[PDB]
Every structure is written in C-alpha cells, then in structure tokens.
Design an enzyme around this catalytic site. Structure first.
Site, PDB file in Angstrom:
ATOM      1  N   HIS B  25      -3.156  -5.155 -55.104  1.00 15.77           N
ATOM      2  CA  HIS B  25      -1.847  -4.791 -55.640  1.00 15.77           C
ATOM      3  C   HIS B  25      -1.017  -6.053 -55.826  1.00 15.77           C
ATOM      4  O   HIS B  25      -0.384  -6.537 -54.870  1.00 15.77           O
ATOM      5  CB  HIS B  25      -1.135  -3.844 -54.693  1.00 15.77           C
ATOM      6  CG  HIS B  25      -1.862  -2.569 -54.442  1.00 15.77           C
ATOM      7  ND1 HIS B  25      -2.954  -2.476 -53.604  1.00 15.77           N
ATOM      8  CD2 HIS B  25      -1.619  -1.316 -54.891  1.00 15.77           C
ATOM      9  CE1 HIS B  25      -3.352  -1.218 -53.551  1.00 15.77           C
ATOM     10  NE2 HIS B  25      -2.560  -0.495 -54.323  1.00 15.77           N
ATOM     11  N   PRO B 114       0.337   4.033 -45.677  1.00 11.93           N
ATOM     12  CA  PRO B 114       0.858   5.405 -45.860  1.00 11.93           C
ATOM     13  C   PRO B 114       2.372   5.342 -45.988  1.00 11.93           C
ATOM     14  O   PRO B 114       3.070   4.891 -45.080  1.00 11.93           O
ATOM     15  CB  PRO B 114       0.406   6.114 -44.580  1.00 11.93           C
ATOM     16  CG  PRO B 114      -0.814   5.267 -44.136  1.00 11.93           C
ATOM     17  CD  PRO B 114      -0.422   3.874 -44.430  1.00 11.93           C
ATOM     18  N   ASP B 154       9.951   2.627 -53.942  1.00 16.69           N
ATOM     19  CA  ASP B 154      10.278   3.962 -54.420  1.00 16.69           C
ATOM     20  C   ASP B 154       9.463   5.034 -53.713  1.00 16.69           C
ATOM     21  O   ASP B 154       9.959   6.138 -53.482  1.00 16.69           O
ATOM     22  CB  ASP B 154      10.014   4.083 -55.922  1.00 16.69           C
ATOM     23  CG  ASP B 154      10.841   3.146 -56.745  1.00 16.69           C
ATOM     24  OD1 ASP B 154      12.069   3.245 -56.649  1.00 16.69           O
ATOM     25  OD2 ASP B 154      10.269   2.322 -57.491  1.00 16.69           O
ATOM     26  N   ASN B 184      12.568  -1.314 -58.615  1.00 21.43           N
ATOM     27  CA  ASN B 184      11.869  -1.861 -59.773  1.00 21.43           C
ATOM     28  C   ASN B 184      11.586  -0.821 -60.857  1.00 21.43           C
ATOM     29  O   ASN B 184      11.054  -1.181 -61.912  1.00 21.43           O
ATOM     30  CB  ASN B 184      10.589  -2.625 -59.362  1.00 21.43           C
ATOM     31  CG  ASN B 184       9.530  -1.748 -58.754  1.00 21.43           C
ATOM     32  OD1 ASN B 184       9.564  -0.528 -58.877  1.00 21.43           O
ATOM     33  ND2 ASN B 184       8.570  -2.373 -58.088  1.00 21.43           N
ATOM     34  N   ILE B 186       9.444   1.542 -61.249  1.00 26.19           N
ATOM     35  CA  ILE B 186       8.050   1.796 -61.596  1.00 26.19           C
ATOM     36  C   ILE B 186       7.327   2.442 -60.422  1.00 26.19           C
ATOM     37  O   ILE B 186       7.438   1.982 -59.281  1.00 26.19           O
ATOM     38  CB  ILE B 186       7.345   0.482 -62.003  1.00 26.19           C
ATOM     39  CG1 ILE B 186       7.911  -0.048 -63.324  1.00 26.19           C
ATOM     40  CG2 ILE B 186       5.829   0.656 -62.078  1.00 26.19           C
ATOM     41  CD1 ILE B 186       7.594   0.822 -64.531  1.00 26.19           C
ATOM     42  N   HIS B 260       0.936  -2.711 -60.891  1.00 25.77           N
ATOM     43  CA  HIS B 260       1.095  -2.204 -59.536  1.00 25.77           C
ATOM     44  C   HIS B 260      -0.178  -2.341 -58.709  1.00 25.77           C
ATOM     45  O   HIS B 260      -0.134  -2.830 -57.574  1.00 25.77           O
ATOM     46  CB  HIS B 260       1.523  -0.740 -59.573  1.00 25.77           C
ATOM     47  CG  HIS B 260       1.361  -0.040 -58.263  1.00 25.77           C
ATOM     48  ND1 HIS B 260       2.238  -0.211 -57.215  1.00 25.77           N
ATOM     49  CD2 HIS B 260       0.399   0.801 -57.815  1.00 25.77           C
ATOM     50  CE1 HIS B 260       1.837   0.513 -56.185  1.00 25.77           C
ATOM     51  NE2 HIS B 260       0.721   1.134 -56.522  1.00 25.77           N
ATOM     52  N   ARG B 357       3.614  23.797 -19.489  1.00 28.82           N
ATOM     53  CA  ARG B 357       4.813  23.096 -19.949  1.00 28.82           C
ATOM     54  C   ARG B 357       5.724  22.740 -18.774  1.00 28.82           C
ATOM     55  O   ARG B 357       6.360  21.678 -18.773  1.00 28.82           O
ATOM     56  CB  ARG B 357       5.564  23.875 -21.032  1.00 28.82           C
ATOM     57  CG  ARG B 357       6.162  25.170 -20.612  1.00 28.82           C
ATOM     58  CD  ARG B 357       7.024  25.756 -21.717  1.00 28.82           C
ATOM     59  NE  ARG B 357       7.560  27.037 -21.292  1.00 28.82           N
ATOM     60  CZ  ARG B 357       8.770  27.493 -21.581  1.00 28.82           C
ATOM     61  NH1 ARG B 357       9.598  26.770 -22.305  1.00 28.82           N
ATOM     62  NH2 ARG B 357       9.146  28.676 -21.118  1.00 28.82           N
ATOM     63  N   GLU B 410       9.887  16.065 -36.951  1.00 25.03           N
ATOM     64  CA  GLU B 410       8.677  15.809 -36.166  1.00 25.03           C
ATOM     65  C   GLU B 410       7.922  14.573 -36.652  1.00 25.03           C
ATOM     66  O   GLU B 410       7.437  13.772 -35.838  1.00 25.03           O
ATOM     67  CB  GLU B 410       7.753  17.026 -36.173  1.00 25.03           C
ATOM     68  CG  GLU B 410       8.383  18.275 -35.581  1.00 25.03           C
ATOM     69  CD  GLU B 410       9.308  19.030 -36.515  1.00 25.03           C
ATOM     70  OE1 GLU B 410       9.311  18.746 -37.737  1.00 25.03           O
ATOM     71  OE2 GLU B 410      10.035  19.917 -36.009  1.00 25.03           O
ATOM     72  N   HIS B 460       3.503  25.392 -26.201  1.00 27.53           N
ATOM     73  CA  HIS B 460       3.344  26.680 -26.878  1.00 27.53           C
ATOM     74  C   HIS B 460       2.054  26.666 -27.699  1.00 27.53           C
ATOM     75  O   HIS B 460       2.034  26.723 -28.924  1.00 27.53           O
ATOM     76  CB  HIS B 460       4.602  27.032 -27.673  1.00 27.53           C
ATOM     77  CG  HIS B 460       5.815  27.185 -26.813  1.00 27.53           C
ATOM     78  ND1 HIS B 460       6.419  26.127 -26.159  1.00 27.53           N
ATOM     79  CD2 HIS B 460       6.516  28.290 -26.477  1.00 27.53           C
ATOM     80  CE1 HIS B 460       7.447  26.584 -25.466  1.00 27.53           C
ATOM     81  NE2 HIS B 460       7.535  27.889 -25.652  1.00 27.53           N
ATOM     82  N   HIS B 472       3.652  30.163 -35.963  1.00 27.71           N
ATOM     83  CA  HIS B 472       3.895  29.310 -34.812  1.00 27.71           C
ATOM     84  C   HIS B 472       2.719  29.221 -33.850  1.00 27.71           C
ATOM     85  O   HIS B 472       2.642  28.247 -33.098  1.00 27.71           O
ATOM     86  CB  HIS B 472       5.133  29.798 -34.041  1.00 27.71           C
ATOM     87  CG  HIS B 472       6.431  29.428 -34.694  1.00 27.71           C
ATOM     88  ND1 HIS B 472       6.776  29.826 -35.970  1.00 27.71           N
ATOM     89  CD2 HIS B 472       7.462  28.672 -34.247  1.00 27.71           C
ATOM     90  CE1 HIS B 472       7.968  29.341 -36.274  1.00 27.71           C
ATOM     91  NE2 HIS B 472       8.404  28.635 -35.247  1.00 27.71           N
TER      92      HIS B 472
HETATM   93 CA   LIG Z   1       8.289   0.955 -57.365  1.00 26.34          CA
END
Ligand SMILES: [Ca+2]
Ligand SMILES: [Ca+2]
Ligand code: NA
Ligand code: NA
Lengths: 665, 667
Positions: B25, B114, B154, B184, B186, B260, B357, B410, B460, B472
């Site tokens: 990249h 990620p 972005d 940028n 893009i 990119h 718990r 979470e 739970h 749940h």
């Molecule tokens: Ca971008």
C-alpha cells in the site's frame, strides 16, 4: 379518555405483565408510553387484520428490552395477541417472549434486543421502501409510500453500529425514516453522564439528519408537533430528542436504574396506580380505552384503499404488478431453477481456472437478469470482493438501482441487509473480506435466528490471500459459521461449486448463506452428471476406488486440488483411496443417512481432512482415528505459495499424514 | 535538506519497498509523509535505542495498511530495523510484515490493520498514561508525562468502533491524545462522497474533542502550528483534519484509488522520482539525510534526563518507585502465588453453592488488594457482570482509580483494553454478557494475536440465564473462542474452579483469558489435594471407578453437577463410570500426551459430553462412537429451569443417553 389515560394503559399492562412474570423491563415502556400513544394513534399506517400488508408503515423497537411496550401496543390496537398472551410474558412458547421475535407474534417486524441492531434494521427497511418506490411507482400510481419509525435508547446510541447505519442513512437522504431517542439519562450502571456525554443532536446533524431537540416526551402536544415537523422534512432522516423519565409514574423508582430491568414490586405498583390515577386491576382494560386504541376499522379502510390503488396499477402496468406481488411474497421466478441449472452445466462443460471470488461475480452476472430483486453491496471492497455485475446500479446515483456502496461498515451493512430482507421485495447480498465477518458477527447470527434470506459473500478466505498477513488471513472463522444454528456455509472448490452455492443461497426460504471465496485461482474438477448433481448435497464423492476405500480424504475449497494430488499418488501405489469434496457441511448433514453413508462409510475410519482453516472443526468428520491437515496457529505475512508450504499444505505432507494413518489401521 | 526532502525519504522507501515486494500500500505512506516528518522530527519524545522506555510518547498507525510509513520512520530515526528488513517487506519471517506487528519489530506499539482498532488502542494508551500519572506522580516528581499520537483514515472513521472509543475519549477529557485524520477523499470503492458524507469535524466536536479544520497536510508549517495548538489544549483530545493527496508525488496515480493498495509500477515510480526531485536509487539514503532524521542523540538525552527524574523519585518515594518498575515490567507481586493458593484452598474447604459470576466477583475482591495494577471495567453491566469490588474506584470520578465505566461499547472496550495492556503498568479486565463477545469478536482475536494479558469476564453463559431468550442465550460462542489460536477459555463448574481460572488468567503473560460464567448457582464438587491442583491442567478426573471405565462423562461449567448426578445413578447400578471436568480445553490440550491419556484413555470410546452449548464442538473429545448432550438450536424465552428440562439437561435424559450409547456399543 384523555391521551394520558390511553398511554397509562401501556404503563399498567407493562408493569403488571413484568410483575406476573417476575422478570423483564418495565422502565422503558413506562417512559415511552406517551410517545407511543401519539405515534400509533395519530400517525402509524397499519392494519391489525393483516400484519403483512405490503404498504404498511414499519415500526421498530431498537431498545428491545422494552418488549412489553410493543406487546401492549399490538394488543390494544387489535392485533391477534390476546390478554392471555400478555399474562404469559416470558413463559415457555408464549407469543410474548422477553425480547420481541419476528414470526412469533403478529405485528412484530424484527427480532431486537441486541442494542443498535434495531435502528440498523430500520435503516434497511427505509432503504427498501425508497428503492422499491423508485423501481415500481409510476405517474399517477404511487403504490409504495410508507414510513419507517424507530424507537431507540442510550445503549443503541453508544453502540458503534448506530454510527455506521445513521451515517449511511444521512448519505442516502432517507426522508421517510423517523427515529425517536428515549433521552432518559439512565443506563444499567446508573446516571449516564459518567460514561456518555455526546451532544447527540450535533452528532446526528453531522450525519445530515434533521434533529428536533428538547421534546417533552410526556406531553402529547409536544410530541405530535415534532412528528409533524419530521414528516414535513422529506430529504433527511429525522431524530426526535425525547426527554423522558424512565419508569414514569412510579414515585420511588421513576428516574432510577432500578426501574430498567427488574419488576417494580407489588407495593410500588400500587403506589404507581395511585400516582397515575389508574383504577383498573391487572389485565383489566375498559371498553372505552379499547374503543379509542383499536385500529381495525381505520386499518382495514386504509388497506382496502391501497388494494384499490394496486388494482388500478395492475391494469396500467400488468407485468410490473405481477413482479411486485412475486417479490413481496419472496417467491422465485418459475424458470430460475431451470436457467440456473443450465448455467451450472455450461460451467462444468467449459472448464476455467479462476478464483472463486471471480466465479461468484460470474454467478451474479448470470443470475442478475433473472433476479431483479437483488439489492447487493460491499463494505468498500467492490473491486476486491467482485460484487458488481454489468447491470449493477448504485442507489446513491439512481434510486431505482440495485447496489449499495456500504462503506467501511461491516456490522451496519449486515444488519441493514437484515432490514432489507425483513421488509420484503428484495434479496440482499452483502460482502467483505472473510476476516471481517468478526466485525459483523452478531448481525450474521441474527439473520440466522430470524430465518432471513441473505447471501453473505466473504472473500480472501485463507492464508491463500498472501502478504497482508495474520490480521487478515482467516483461520477459525469458517468453523464458527459452521456451528451456528440455521446458517448455511459453502466453501466452493471451483467455479462450478461456486455457482451451485450461489443457487443454494438465493433459493433458501428460511435462512442465510455464507460463501467462502478465494483470492487465488482454483482448478476446475471433472465431474460426471451424478457428481455435478450432487454438489448441491454439500458433500459428495469426487474421486473414488473400486470397492470399499482404505482411505478417504475430505477436502474443501482451495484444498481440493491438493487432496486430489495426494489421492493420485496413493492410488498409483495401489491404495484404495477416495476424495470427498465437502463444500457445505450443513447441506451434507441434512442429507438422508444412506447418502451420507455412501460418501463417508461408517466402517472406514482412516479419514484425512484437508482445509486451510482451524483443524479442531474436522473431528466432527474424522473422529479420533483420523488425521487433519489444517491450521493450528495464526498466519504469517508472505506470498501465498510460500505460506502453503510453510503450513504443510503440500502433497508430501498430506501423503505422509495419510500413510502414518494407514499404519494404525 | 528541506523538510519536503526529508519527508520524500519516506515516500521513496515506501514506494520502492512495495514495488520490490510486488505487494502493499504505497498511497497512504506517500500522502502522510509530511505530517509524519513534522510529528516525528519536531515533537515525538522517544529513544530509538530503548523502545521500552516507560515514559516515551506512544505512536499508533490505525490505518495500518500504510505499514511502510512506520517502517520508514523507525529505520530513518535509528531503531534496530536495518535496510535489509525493508528489502524484505512482506516476506516470510521478516521484521516488516504487511501490517505492523507488536513484538517482532523494534518500536511498533501495536498490531494494526483491522480498521478502527488502532485508534481504540490509542485511546487505551492515553487512558493508561492519565491513570498511571494520577496514581504515581507526586509534588515535584511528575514521572509519568507522555502523549499518545494516532494516525487514522476514512476507513477508521466509518467504522463503528471509532464512535465508541472517541465518544469515551471525550468523556474522559484525554488531553494528551492527538489524532491526525488523513482526509484524502479516497477509499477502495473510489471517491468517498458516494458512501461517506459526514461532517467529521462536527461529529468529533459532538464528542467533546478539540478539532482543527482544513490543515494543509503537505505544508510543514501548517502541520506544526496545528500540533502546537493541540498540545496547548490540555482538557480535550484533539483531531487534526489533514487534507492530503493519496500517493502524493505520483503524476498519474496521486489522488486516485489506484494508489491505495497496489504497487505504483516501475514506470510510474520513475516519474514520481522526477516530480519529487528524489535522485537516490531504491534503498539508498545519503548520510546527510540520516543525520537529519536520526533520533539517537536526542532520544538518549531525553531518556537520561527521565532516568535522573526517576532516581530522584525513588529516593523520595522508594516503595512507589518499586511498584512502578514492577508494574511497567508486567511482573506479579512476589507473594501473589502463595496468597492466591491460600484463597483457593479456603474455598475448597468451605463450600458455597453460588453463581460463577459471584465466584468471579469474590476472586476480584480477594485479588484486588494484591493487584493494584488492575484496571477493570464493564460495558454498562457492572451490577450484572459483578465487576466491582469494595476497592473499585471509577476513573471518571478520580483519575487515580482502577475502574472504567465503558458504556454500551463492547468492541471499543475490548480494543481499548488492548491498548491498556500494550501500554504497560496495568492488568486490564473487561466484561459483558457472553453473547456480546460477538460485538467485540475481532478485538478478542487481536488480544490473542498480540499475546496480550487481559481477563475477559463473560457472564450469563447459557440458557441458564432464562427469560431474556435466544438473542441473549449463548450456544455457539464458547466453541468459537475455543478454536481461536492463543486464546484461553475457562468455564468453571464451581467457585473453586472459578478462582483457579482467575489466577490462571492474571498469571498468563502471553495471551488473554476468557472466563465463561453462570447466572445461576453452581454446586461445589469435592476434591482431593491432587484434584484441586489438577484444575489448572484444564481437564481432570473428578469421579472415577476401579479398572477401565466403560463410560466417561466429559462436562464443563454448570453441567458438571448434572454429569456427576448421572455418574452416581449409573455407579449405583453397577456401571463403571468416570467424570472428567474440562474447565479449559486449551489448557488441557497443552498438557503432555501421558497426562491427556490418563484423563481420556484411548481405550475408552464410550464418551458422553455434557454442556449447554453447541454440540458439534465436542466431537473433538468424544469421537464418532460417543454421545453429546448439548444444544443444536437457538434458545427460547422461558424460566431457566424449564429450558434445561426442554433441552434435555436432566439426569433422566443424560442417564438414558449414556445407557443408549452403551447398548449400541454392546450390540
Ligand atoms: Ca482514505
Ligand atoms: Ca436509557
Ligand atoms: Na421526513
Ligand atoms: Na492536548
């Protein structure tokens, strides 16, 4: 009766039903009852006698813990939800489960509870209405025209998915989406200021929403004016900032976290009746209150008027009207099966070595002209996931189109698509790299739980993606999908299996289908007519021996070629070997037991699974006396060919593991 | 050299390293090089010769695809990252993997890629600095004082996790967090306006951030002024809106999506050198450019001054200084093992039938006084997850506290906690209902990939939660955790196994530990001293027979009580049976072959797994000739005791399934 008395009927039914169950959430129903009374009695277009009316408004409770709110509304307005069901709230196999469930209960539009997903579903329902209107309405014939109303609370607002879907709703100018924020200052940990301080109105203006601040959520006049204003703004979704008191009516628990998620208690309910001036016993509603809440007469008149409009449309636009009915029913074109089978047969007869991501694009191209109901998209990966076909038209460019640029929003995309499938009229497909199923994971689960048809196109499925490395290389994601109830998962080994998997996905009537697709080119396998027909059975004999096998390879996806190469080596030595291609474990498991025995004979325990994914899954088919050539670690950043060698996806290693196994047998 | 020439060294190394790898990249490194040159050369407080200096500023690349940006910076400033490693970008076992990875590359603070998680990690690092400063600084002795700088694009902005963590950063008034947005226009699909139209500045102002708009990201003076402004704002995190051109320098690919995520190509690189005026060949940097980029002399001086400050602190506050060193090293108190063993032994000797718990809360209460490094929290479920102990103090109330109200966030919580563990000084624990591990699922994976210590308290855990129903009630979530590389997952059957699992988790230095905890009360099982010690081996013999068993039950969590009851019935009828408690499959699998054979002997194929979770997982231990009393469906909304009956978790059904299995084996 006064509007406050009519709203208090919701408060009484809700607190009493929670009390009888000794379980549930009285606070939000009591806090939102005045808002619900205005919305439902003065604005909502619906027919209790036909909850499936195609042009009804859609209502969504994103703060789904407040389930007695919707059950009260459905009961009071005349849906098929009798008082005895409210007296069975949270009881086994009642129509009033603790969180609302689509299909369980007349008039429930979606299953909510997991916070943030209801507003996402509502965004999808509003996208569906806008797109269907653009596709089907004609001059003088506006057969699609309905609103999407959502209730949501602080938890939905805090969740990241609200940012994803409300940002996109702003971009798409969803002027028939109207959301009510239950701005009550309370969450489970207490006063929200310690952890939630956003200027929520400013945030939503940043998304391009119309925002109405400072509504008194306990004043019918204030609420009604705000709804009128929101309905007048036709080019932006609207957020109504409704100041409410959780548990409104309870002298000691209103405004407290105590009212959120536990019964109020008998003494406090008695004090609440006194404060509200509510003179009726639990589960008693007087006839005057039913008369003012009932929607059967008005709803039937509105639906009948719509039916007359649709009849006139069908006279002017007969083919379009037939398509509308077919699509709203979720039915497939009558010739789709035959045409898709013809495409699949053509692929088998005309081999191509292409990535299954490209084979997926090719199936979309073949099925696109046949399935105008497609409403597809990708999470900012169209050129990588290969989700565009020649007929794709982005809905941000043409509202009558069939493609959504979802942006980098995997969870929101998937829950929006759940709303699209719940609306009717469309067949959604979504797409991202397989790793990012983990971002969207609970929305995938919710599609399965709600029995919704959605094709989930997951590309870049293994270490075969190469240099991007272990943060992107799936290992354990497919195994998780495979053990999800009601999920179908296909990992096709070539372009033919890819088309069969796509066909299976679009033909499901009762749940979603994940496609597990390669970056790299996959060789096409030769097949007899019987093998070709058996791909759809999820597992089948691809290569065989005469007589009972001594050794069975079970392989999927990109690893079928490797298993075949090991089979050829061992066959040449004189081993009675077999290769099973297992593109879908779920479809295989659903086959009759004679078929399963014909593929994986119970007497043959020398089984070697081969898959570039987590090994632990495969004990299901190899047991304790087989072998697994799989991954047991995260990946590495390197070229794919070197990774397959590094991790043991070599003919030598597969053969060695099979020979080691044959000693023991 | 001019500042632009110095920034162009990043551009050259980045485009050339991508080209040699034929992968990667180049666009974002080229677009952000001028910003990076100002930040790193004029502001960043760091020592290349000691990337572990406790008081260094932390830098995070949330747009982690731009990995050559950080490799260029680390190489140029003098970290132990030789040019040969840049020549091996994206090659097997190099120090320059395609997305940056903590651990193997000097100076990389976190593993990113990620999208959205890097900014979350940075929020955690900034929380850690603020909390550690409040805990340790004293009048005249400000031994903790450093910034957290993040780059993001972005994709990070679109991701929901950015909303979670930047909202919370605003509440916590993280004045030493400074983020740079690579604005940028893009993304991979093209011009972002078709799918991304937020007024991002207004959004961040809604969170309580100080936002600096319309910065020319290719003008060093503008960038420098903006950083100075953000450093002057001490009571809000800051967002610098940097207008950049992706692929800056490339005549034909700057400003395009093509820049990119693929090599520019050799012909385009030649044209880019000409546009930038960069004459040096690939992987060539002249001594005079190294002289201007190198940070060894300034970094030594800064760390040496800090070490003098720390020595003065240690003279005035000796016990505090010893605690600071211990905690920054991630070392446990010397008496923790003995005290935790004493607690565990007391529980085994003093039965209590309580929910796991609650047993978890009791372990936090017992450990809390011993582990001042705890920085715990829950995603708006403190009274349900039971994450507070008597010594908890929320950091929004007192910055020297030890507890975070994360809100309904979470994913953000978990990735913030990854930042907390990566910072040093703390042992984070996080908590939500088990189902909502699915909201946070990739951050859990990232903790495992990064080998981070974090205890994940998931309550739970099954249909045992009752009336809230199938949205749940976990079914398949534990199995997903169990098949995650480097994850540890414990489903304790009683208060004793719960305390053992907590001890295991806090002592596990090289990966995270999830605790799978019940709403409902769990019977305590009897154990000899050897069985008590064997809990930590993950799977162990709890009940046995003389001679080879004809039946082995394998059970976890709340289902051990049921398996034991079935064992007792069958034993009274003369059946030779055994019960194995399997609180942790991952710990069991790590035991040697002899131990695993002693628990699950290969001769015994009549194995019955019992767990209120997805059945298909259990073929791993029961094989093809056993039985599984498990779930195969979603749950239902009803009282828990009725759900256990409806789904077959009854003594009669377990006994019947075991006898049916034996009958099949006999015939
Ligand atoms: Ca971008
Ligand atoms: Ca609230
Ligand atoms: Na409107
Ligand atoms: Na600042």
């Amino acid at each position: 009766s006064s509007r406050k008395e009519l709203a208090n009927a919701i408060r009484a039914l809700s607190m009493d039903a929670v009390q009888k169950a000794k379980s549930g959430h009285p606070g939000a129903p009591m806090g939102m009852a005045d808002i619900a009374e205005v919305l439902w009695r003065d604005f909502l277009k619906h027919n209790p006698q036909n909850p499936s009316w195609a042009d009804r408004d859609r209502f969504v409770l994103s703060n789904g813990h407040g389930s007695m709110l919707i059950y009260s509304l459905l009961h009071l307005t005349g849906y098929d939800l009798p008082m005895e069901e409210l007296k069975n709230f949270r009881q086994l196999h009642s129509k009033t489960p603790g969180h609302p469930e689509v299909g369980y209960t007349a008039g429930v539009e979606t299953t909510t509870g997991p916070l943030g997903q209801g507003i996402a579903n509502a965004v999808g329902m509003a996208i569906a209405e806008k797109t269907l209107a653009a596709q089907f309405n004609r001059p003088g014939h506006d057969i699609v025209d309905h609103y999407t109303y959502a209730f949501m609370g602080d938890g939905c607002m805090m969740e990241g998915i609200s940012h994803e879907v409300c940002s996109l709703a702003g971009t798409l100018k969803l002027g028939k989406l109207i959301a009510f924020y239950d701005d009550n200052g309370i969450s489970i940990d207490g006063h929200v200021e310690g952890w939630f301080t956003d200027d929520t109105a400013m945030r939503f203006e940043a998304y391009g929403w119309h925002v109405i601040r400072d509504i008194d959520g306990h004043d019918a006049a204030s609420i009604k004016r705000a709804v009128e204003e929101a309905r007048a703004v036709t080019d932006k979704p609207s957020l109504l900032m409704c100041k409410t008191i959780i548990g409104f009516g309870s002298p000691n628990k209103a405004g407290t976290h105590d009212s959120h998620g536990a019964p109020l208690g008998d003494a406090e309910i008695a004090l609440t009746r006194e404060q509200l001036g509510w003179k009726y016993a639990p589960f008693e509603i007087p006839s005057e209150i039913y008369a003012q809440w009932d929607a059967k007469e008005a709803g039937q008149a509105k639906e009948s008027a719509w039916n007359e409009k649709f009849a006139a449309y069908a006279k002017a636009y007969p083919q379009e009207a037939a398509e509308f009915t077919r699509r709203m029913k979720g039915e497939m074109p009558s010739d789709f099966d035959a045409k898709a089978k013809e495409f699949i047969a053509k692929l088998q007869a005309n081999p191509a070595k292409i990535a299954s991501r490209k084979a997926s694009q090719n199936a979309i191209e073949a099925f696109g002209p046949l399935l105008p109901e497609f409403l597809g998209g990708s999470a900012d990966l169209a050129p990588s996931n290969l989700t565009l076909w020649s007929g794709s038209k982005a809905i941000n460019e043409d509202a009558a189109g069939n493609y959504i640029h979802y942006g980098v929003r995997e969870f929101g995309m998937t829950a929006i698509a759940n709303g699209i499938s719940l609306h009717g009229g469309f067949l959604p497909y979504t797409s991202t790299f397989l790793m990012f199923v983990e971002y969207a994971r609970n929305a995938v689960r919710m599609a399965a739980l709600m029995k919704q048809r959605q094709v989930m196109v997951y590309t870049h499925d293994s270490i075969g993606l190469g240099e991007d490395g272990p943060t992107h290389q799936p290992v354990e994601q497919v195994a998780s999908l495979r053990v999800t109830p009601n999920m179908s998962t296909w990992r096709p080994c070539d372009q033919v299996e890819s088309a069969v998997a796509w066909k299976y996905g679009v033909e499901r009537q009762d749940g979603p289908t994940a496609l597990i697709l390669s970056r790299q080119n996959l060789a096409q396998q030769e097949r007899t007519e019987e093998q070709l027909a058996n791909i759809a059975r999820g597992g089948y004999v691809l290569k065989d021996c005469a007589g009972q096998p001594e050794l069975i390879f079970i392989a999927t996806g990109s690893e079928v070629e490797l298993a075949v190469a090991a089979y050829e080596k061992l066959t040449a030595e004189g081993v009675k070997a077999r290769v099973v291609s297992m593109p879908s474990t779920d479809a295989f498991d659903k086959q009759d037991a004679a078929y399963r025995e014909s593929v994986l004979p119970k007497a043959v325990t020398a089984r070697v699974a081969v898959e570039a994914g987590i090994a632990d899954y495969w004990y299901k088919y190899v047991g304790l006396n087989g072998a697994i050539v799989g991954m047991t670690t995260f990946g590495e950043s390197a070229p794919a060919e070197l990774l397959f060698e590094e991790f043991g996806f070599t003919v030598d290693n597969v053969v060695a593991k099979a020979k080691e196994l044959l000693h023991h047998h």
